Design an enzyme around this catalytic site. Structure first.
Site, PDB file in Angstrom:
ATOM      1  N   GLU A 141       1.349  21.638 -13.320  1.00 14.16           N
ATOM      2  CA  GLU A 141       0.144  21.429 -14.136  1.00 14.16           C
ATOM      3  C   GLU A 141      -1.000  20.906 -13.272  1.00 14.16           C
ATOM      4  OE1 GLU A 141       0.032  22.901 -16.808  1.00 14.16           O
ATOM      5  OE2 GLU A 141       1.771  22.592 -18.109  1.00 14.16           O
TER       6      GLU A 141
ATOM      7  N   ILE B  20       8.598  26.389 -13.207  1.00 15.54           N
ATOM      8  CA  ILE B  20       9.731  25.935 -12.430  1.00 15.54           C
ATOM      9  C   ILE B  20      10.975  26.658 -12.952  1.00 15.54           C
ATOM     10  CG2 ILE B  20      11.283  23.957 -12.050  1.00 15.54           C
ATOM     11  CD1 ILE B  20       8.845  22.186 -11.739  1.00 15.54           C
TER      12      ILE B  20
ATOM     13  N   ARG C 164      -2.631  23.706 -11.522  1.00 17.88           N
ATOM     14  CA  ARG C 164      -3.439  24.538 -12.417  1.00 17.88           C
ATOM     15  C   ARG C 164      -4.789  23.919 -12.763  1.00 17.88           C
ATOM     16  NH1 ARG C 164       1.466  25.356 -16.668  1.00 17.88           N
ATOM     17  NH2 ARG C 164       2.569  27.127 -15.728  1.00 17.88           N
TER      18      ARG C 164
END
Ligand SMILES: CC(=O)N[C@@H]1[C@@H](O)[C@H](O)[C@@H](CO)O[C@H]1O
Ligand SMILES: CC(=O)N[C@@H]1[C@@H](O)[C@H](O)[C@@H](CO)O[C@H]1O
Length: 241
Positions: free
Chosen positions: A159, A71, A162
């Protein structure tokens, strides 16, 4: 752009949002059927925008660097806020054109954010309600609570994109917030190492050159040494390049 609205949200709409975010990131192919991110990108095309709205419908737009899913900063009203790091300063040249730019007093690094928030990720509750509160904090820009808000947002968006496991953890916390599992923390910490090792394994009969230690559902150390591991086959969704 991608978007997630907390108002009317469900496990289904959250998963759709995370899938859309994964799909928005360009690849240079796949390695073991996992998306490989771009090594480099230029200008505005280095970013994807993510609109987040709280239960009350108040919205912010967050800029993500497509090369690493970091970010960079966000826009609310006519003001943008960018992390104090060179890649985020770069982002400010290309996104949220016309906004008044504020440089935040910290980088987007976990250690720096945790120092700024006065608390570690391990102790910050996550979930749909936590996401709501985080968006509200950034919407009003309360400078004293923003670092903590970023810690929530990063984990709940980047996250989660991912790692399918982390996506599942957020879904578990749709109604009641909870601190991250030890597994969640380890995966976040080892994303770059996993990314590196999975790529090395291609030409090593699927074996890592250096093992990666993750934690399981009970916090036990588990050494990952090859691509047969569930972390590789049914968890990780994006590889750093
Ligand atoms: C003033 C400003 O906003 N720009 C800084 C730049 O001076 C610094 O070198 C870099 C960290 O390397 O972070 C940027 O945010
Ligand atoms: C940082 C900032 O200026 N945020 C303001 C918020 O505090 C205010 O409640 C709203 C009024 O509509 O405009 C927001 O985006």
């Amino acid at each position: 752009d991608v978007s997630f609205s907390l108002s009317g949200s469900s496990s289904t709409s959250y998963s759709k949002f995370i899938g859309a975010l994964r799909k928005a990131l360009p690849s240079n192919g796949t390695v073991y059927n996992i998306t490989l991110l771009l090594s480099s990108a230029s200008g505005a095309s280095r970013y994807t925008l993510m609109k987040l709205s709280n239960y009350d419908g108040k919205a912010i737009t967050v800029a993500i660097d497509v090369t690493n899913v970091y970010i960079m900063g966000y826009l609310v009203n006519s003001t943008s806020y960018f992390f104090n790091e060179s890649d985020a300063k770069l982002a400010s040249q290309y996104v949220f054109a016309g906004s008044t730019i504020v440089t935040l007093p910290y980088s987007g690094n976990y250690e720096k954010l945790q120092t700024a928030a006065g608390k570690i990720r391990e102790k910050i509750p996550l979930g749909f309600p936590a996401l709501d509160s985080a968006i509200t904090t950034l919407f009003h820009y309360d400078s004293t609570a923003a670092a903590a808000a970023f810690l929530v947002i990063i984990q709940t968006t980047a996250e989660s994109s991912r790692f399918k496991y982390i996506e599942g953890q957020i879904i578990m916390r749709i109604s009641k917030n909870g601190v991250p599992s030890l597994a969640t923390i380890s995966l976040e910490n080892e994303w770059s190492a996993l990314s590196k090792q999975i790529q090395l394994a291609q030409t090593n009969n699927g074996t890592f050159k250096t093992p990666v230690v993750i934690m399981d559902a009970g916090g036990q150390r588990v050494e990952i040494g090859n691509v047969g591991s569930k972390v590789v086959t049914k968890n990780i969704q994006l590889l750093l390049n």
